[PDB]
């Protein structure tokens, strides 16, 4: 069937069909263009006219321009041939290395795995990051979310995790760049070539790359996430072998949707979002999951507008996760990195029956001394410290030490800390936090605990601080 553009407003394009009317979600190819311009059918307005969202800029389009129905939703390359390659929203290579010679293609819109396909198994995935491993440990094949306002550490954390988990990883990885920094994509790409995680010469690449950054119009940012998870699904199902899936940043999927919502004719919901925020999010998120056929360990960076976690975007995201790592500006501002909020990060596996009561109790003990200090803070800032008991102030000093022992020099962060990166074993984390709680370090100065790895370095720094 052939159509004719009857209207253009930004990324939203109305096309008219004399005969066959393409169904919602079908991909239409615009004729007369230097580069492939795809339109996705969103609605049937009536009178043989459909409303669509463009997957690239609409500058240059004219009313009356011809449009062809491909007779299906956007279909992209999937399989071993995508490894080491970079694709865009519509599965075209963007690494200037030629065609992606795959034997199969797959639609980026798919039904989510059924309830009978779910898995309940859950095992610890140690990261080497003290706060995470201790307070809200991640799980193999589980859903992990990293929340954070602008510039608090989301990306640095995901890059560190890729470094500590995906290099060792024997399966395959998928990284989806969704409405983020193009510079970050060129960064990551050369980073991975160096680590040999990506190989341009042989066929030993272990990671597939998909990108649609903030330089692209909304249609592309609204579907690139689907593109990336579509690649991941093939590895999970058509190979079973373990898959890692990293998304920076999936909020951008929701923001893209809101950029065009009013143009799509919707009445705004609260805070200027599309009335379909939750359902839009559900049909996408329910695809990012481990199943009986295979496992997917997902790590998604989640933007928090105006630093307000009650914002509908981030707020509707908590329900799709197994482990939440919440990052705070108030903590980053203090030089504490990673800026994890110890009183707002959680894990479904933080249970004595899963991690052992030693792990559980120390974590729980750390949370208690911190909530207690926090509740104390404003009081002593006014009446001073002198009114506290010797024990009440002994917790004030350990609380501050513990808060400092949660900070950590990331390997990936060397260019920022001026410190050599550090990786701490789980047992060493528990031990260290346990000892401080027990009082075995009340004589060392606070700064000894700041920006170090294992508790030994705290002792050694204290020595380096003495004289």
């Amino acid at each position: 069937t052939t159509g004719r553009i009857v209207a253009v407003i930004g990324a939203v394009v109305d096309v008219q069909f004399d005969e066959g009317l393409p169904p919602i979600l079908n991909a239409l190819e615009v004729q007369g263009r230097e580069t492939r311009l795809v339109l996705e059918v969103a609605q049937h307005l009536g009178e043989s006219t459909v409303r669509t969202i463009a997957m690239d800029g609409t500058e240059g389009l004219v009313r009356g321009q011809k449009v062809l129905d491909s007779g299906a939703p956007i279909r992209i390359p999937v399989g071993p041939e995508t490894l080491g390659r970079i694709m865009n929203v519509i599965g075209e290579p963007i690494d200037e290395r030629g065609p992606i010679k795959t034997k199969q293609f797959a639609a980026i819109h798919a039904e989510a795995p059924e309830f009978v396909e779910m898995s309940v198994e859950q095992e610890i995935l140690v990261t080497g990051i003290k706060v995470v491993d201790l307070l809200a440990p991640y799980a193999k094949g589980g859903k992990i979310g990293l929340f954070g306002g602008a510039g608090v550490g989301k990306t640095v954390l995901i890059m560190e995790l890729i470094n500590n988990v995906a290099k060792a990883h024997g399966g395959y990885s998928v990284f989806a760049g969704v409405g983020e920094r193009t510079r970050e994509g060129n960064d990551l790409y050369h980073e991975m070539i160096e680590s040999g995680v990506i190989n341009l010469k042989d066929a030993t690449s272990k990671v597939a790359l998909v990108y649609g950054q903030m330089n692209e119009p909304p249609g592309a940012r609204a579907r690139v996430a689907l593109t990336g998870l579509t690649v991941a699904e093939y590895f999970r199902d058509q190979e079973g072998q373990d898959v890692l899936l990293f998304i920076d940043n999936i909020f951008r999927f929701t923001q893209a949707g809101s950029e065009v919502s009013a143009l799509l004719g919707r009445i705004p919901s609260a805070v200027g979002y599309q009335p379909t925020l939750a359902t839009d999010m559900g049909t996408m998120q329910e695809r990012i999951t481990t199943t009986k056929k295979g496992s997917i360990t997902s790590v998604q960076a989640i933007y928090v507008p105006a630093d307000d976690l009650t914002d509908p975007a981030p707020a509707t995201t908590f329900a799709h996760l197994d482990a939440t790592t919440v990052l705070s500006r108030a903590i980053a501002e203090l030089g504490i990195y990673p800026a994890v909020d110890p009183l707002d990060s959680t894990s479904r596996i933080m249970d004595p029956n899963i991690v052992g009561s030693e792990h559980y109790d120390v974590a729980r003990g750390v949370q208690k001394i911190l909530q207690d200090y926090k509740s104390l803070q404003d009081i002593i800032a006014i009446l001073g410290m002198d009114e506290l008991s010797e024990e009440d102030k002994l917790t004030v000093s350990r609380a501050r030490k513990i808060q400092r022992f949660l900070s950590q020099p990331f390997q990936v962060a060397e260019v920022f800390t001026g410190h050599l990166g550090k990786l701490v074993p789980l047992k060493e984390t528990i031990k260290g936090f346990q000892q401080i709680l027990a009082g075995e370090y009340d004589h060392l100065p606070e700064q000894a605990f700041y920006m170090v790895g294992p508790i030994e370095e705290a002792v050694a720094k204290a020595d380096k601080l003495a004289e």
């Binding site: 009857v6 209207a7 253009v8 407003i9 930004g10 800029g57 609409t58 500058e59 240059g60 389009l61 004219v62 009313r63 009356g64 963007i94 690494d95 200037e96 602008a150 510039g151 409405g179 920094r181 193009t182 510079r183 060129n186 960064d187 790409y189 050369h190 990108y211 903030m214 330089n215 692209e216 119009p217 909304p218 923001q255 809101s258 950029e259 065009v260 919502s261 009013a262 705004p268 200027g272 933007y303 105006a306 630093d307 500006r329 980053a332 501002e333 203090l334 030089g335 002593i380 800032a381 410290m385 260019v415 920022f416 800390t417 001026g418 410190h419 100065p445 606070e446 700064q447 601080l465």
Partner: protein, 492 residues
């Protein structure tokens, strides 16, 4: 027989109001195509509807009436571009407004071109020295980076960008062509007299010769103020793509967003959060992605951007501000409280950042500033907490001592950007501990004298640090001898 007014290449005004013309015809017009009104006035086709074209007017709409003729140009909006714009003041469309005549540019460029993708780029690594100690050490900028300058009115935002422009004169008058850096100052929504003082400031400093000034002032129509930023950015991409380096300042994007909101609401696009178009983020993300570092295969040139955002009541956490922060490769946050206490530049260290880090610094600067940002953040935390009279161990007392001294060394007056080897020299004296026993109120006088000293008698040391781009064991040994002795004399 007269077919000059067909409805494919021409149209007629259906109605006109508030810079919006609704046009009948123009059947063959393209989305985002420049059109022209009978009056000589230009406009842009934004809304392509079945019965009319929605046109945004680039000037005073009082000149348009119902029925006027509108003509296609066949061209997507673009502007003049090239070196002929250096030393000139132009409007959002590229027209001269300095009274020095026509710009004889030999090339043009689309204002809406998409930013370079992954392949054409390469990691930011070349220093973009502002010449401001606090910036160059704590929140370093590299060529092709984007770094936001944000803060309430009158906190010192414009000043950082001006000094930064003036600073390049070292390299622009130099012989090393790779070090050159052409400047672009985009004025949006400002008062014309303010822009004139500004260009008079740059002329007096002899920086106007390497700067392009793009001005869409308060009385310029909304669409003109909306375009301004994209126009100057194209002028910047000319350098970026022809093996050179350019620096752009958008002062400011708060006002550009207000104009976008005006134009968008008048086009009847339903308002979003805080009455702004639901796509304000994309307005700015799109623009700033155009600042980039190109790889050698692509000429190795670059475009560096310093956008400006004005906060209300020091609220960096609001919507507009967090949007833009979420785009840039860092931000410089300034507060009125610090500005009045004497901390100028009024930078808040914990809240500012650089996403490029030491990769944008010379080895020398990294050798003295490497751990200073985190340390100064911890210093401010413990300082607030110690006010609770609590007993202080030697460790915290030393941190306080060190923090208060460094705070003084990062103070800096206006209009005198420092050479990197000179910043390295004064940072060194503090970070190495030599000033821990000097009364804090003496640190500014010390620095002024110490610096004139090394510049007067230690040009070789300064020159070696600058040439090697580092502090050798030998250079290190000589600095120690200079500071300890000079200090002793100073405290005599």
């Amino acid at each position: 027989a007269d077919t000059s007014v067909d409805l494919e290449e021409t149209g007629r005004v259906l109605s006109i109001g508030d810079g919006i013309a609704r046009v009948h015809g123009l059947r063959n017009v393209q989305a985002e195509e420049m059109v022209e009104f009978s009056s000589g006035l230009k406009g842009m086709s934004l809304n392509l509807e079945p019965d009319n074209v929605g046109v945004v007017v680039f000037g005073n709409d009082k000149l348009i009436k119902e029925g006027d003729i509108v003509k296609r140009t066949g061209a997507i909006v673009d502007v003049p571009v090239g070196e002929e714009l250096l030393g000139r003041v132009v409007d959002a469309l590229g027209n001269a407004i300095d009274g020095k005549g026509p710009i004889g540019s030999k090339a043009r460029r689309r204002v809406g071109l998409k930013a370079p993708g992954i392949i054409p780029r390469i990691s930011v690594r070349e220093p973009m020295q502002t010449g401001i100690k606090a910036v160059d050490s704590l929140v370093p900028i590299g060529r092709g980076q984007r770094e936001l300058i944000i803060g309430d009115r009158q906190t010192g935002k414009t000043s950082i960008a001006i000094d930064t422009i003036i600073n390049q004169k070292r390299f622009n008058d130099g012989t090393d062509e790779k070090k050159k850096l052409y400047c672009i100052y985009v004025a949006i929504g400002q008062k014309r007299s303010t822009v004139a003082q500004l260009v008079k400031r740059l002329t007096d400093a002899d920086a106007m010769k390497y700067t392009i000034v793009v001005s869409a002032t308060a009385s310029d129509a909304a669409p003109l103020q909306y375009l301004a930023p994209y126009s100057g950015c194209s002028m910047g991409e000319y350098f970026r793509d022809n093996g050179k380096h350019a620096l752009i300042i958008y002062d400011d994007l708060s006002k550009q967003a207000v104009a976008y909101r005006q134009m968008s609401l008048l086009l009847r696009r339903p308002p979003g959060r805080e009455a702004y178009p639901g796509d304000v983020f994309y307005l700015h993300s799109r623009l700033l992605e155009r600042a980039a570092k190109m790889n050698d295969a692509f000429g190795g040139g670059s475009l560096t951007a310093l956008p400006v955002i004005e906060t209300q009541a020091g609220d960096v956490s609001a919507y507009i501000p967090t949007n833009v922060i979420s785009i840039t490769d860092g931000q410089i946050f300034l507060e009125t409280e610090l500005f009045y206490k004497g901390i100028r530049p009024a930078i808040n260290v914990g809240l500012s950042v650089s996403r490029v880090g030491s990769a944008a610094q010379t080895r020398a600067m990294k050798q003295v500033a490497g751990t200073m940002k985190l340390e100064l953040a911890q210093y401010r935390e413990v300082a607030a907490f110690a006010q609770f009279g609590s007993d202080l161990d030697a460790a915290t007392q030393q941190l306080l001592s060190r923090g208060v001294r460094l705070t003084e060394l990062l103070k800096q007056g206006q209009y005198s950007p420092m050479a990197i080897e000179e910043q390295v020299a004064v940072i060194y004296a503090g970070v190495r501990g030599y000033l821990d026993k000097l009364e804090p109120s003496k640190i500014t006088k010390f620095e002024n004298a110490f610096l004139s000293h090394v510049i007067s008698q230690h040009q070789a040391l300064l020159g070696k640090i600058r040439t090697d781009g580092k502090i050798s064991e030998e250079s290190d040994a000589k600095l120690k001898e200079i500071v300890t002795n000079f200090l002793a004399g100073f405290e005599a």
